[PDB]
């Protein structure tokens with residue numbers, strides 16, 4: 001079976017309880033995770049140890065909090081106490097865990113399922129070939145010995161409009177924001193990097209990225225996490241918003257792909 005779970009955010013106990021509910025069995029089943037494995041919840045260390053141990057039985061994409069953790073580890077960014085990352089950062093296997101994390105994808109594609117997953121979704125300004133090329137480019141910098149330089153460059157809100165002519169810092173920053181920070185778009189597809197509200201509460205003319213027809217979403221289903229104020233609802237057919245805010249006192253959501261059946265684990269906090 002194929003299971004897709006939204007943002008875990010250190011909620012190890014809820015993750016394991018949900019996997020036990022569906023009797024997740026590596027070797028018979030595969031788990032897809034939308035990223036943001038870490039921060040806010042108490043168990044980021046246990047989450048990373050477990051997910052790394054799954055190997056080929058898990059298909060992860062990196063989220064914005066996973067990248068922030070890497071930046072803290074590399075000394076690029078300051079540790080925020082509310083993220084509760086210190087047990088992971090101080091663990092004796094922190095190097096092993098975080099060198100594994102930075103080699104994971106930003107984009108997962110399964111052609112037989114016609115299924116795409118990224119942390120924030122797929123901007124409507126991208127076709128599939130462009131999304132693949134951009135994912136490959138940023139995965140290459142994150143997996144290289146020089147990844148702290150890119151982590152430092154990644155911060156920023158501009159440019160917010162895609163062009164194949166984009167180069168350099170702006171190109172990488174756009175790619176990172178599209179895959180890991182996107183929520184709202186302007187009508188032409190341009191990213192808005194400020195509004196984090198639910199679609200009903202957003203100022204006009206902002207609309208969800210998935211409300212703008214794009215070439216990937218016309219051919220593939222898209223699963224994503226990230227947008228907790230969406231509460232996993234309000235999406236079109238073929239769009240699966242899996243982040244139901246477990247670390248915020250909401251729920252952890254698991255979707256089984258074969259029958260589109262949902263399973264929910266209440267937050268323990």
Ligand SMILES: [Mn+2]
Nearest residue numbers: 007009036226
């Ligand atoms: Mn998140």
Ligand SMILES: [Mn+2]
Nearest residue numbers: 036063064226
């Ligand atoms: Mn996120």
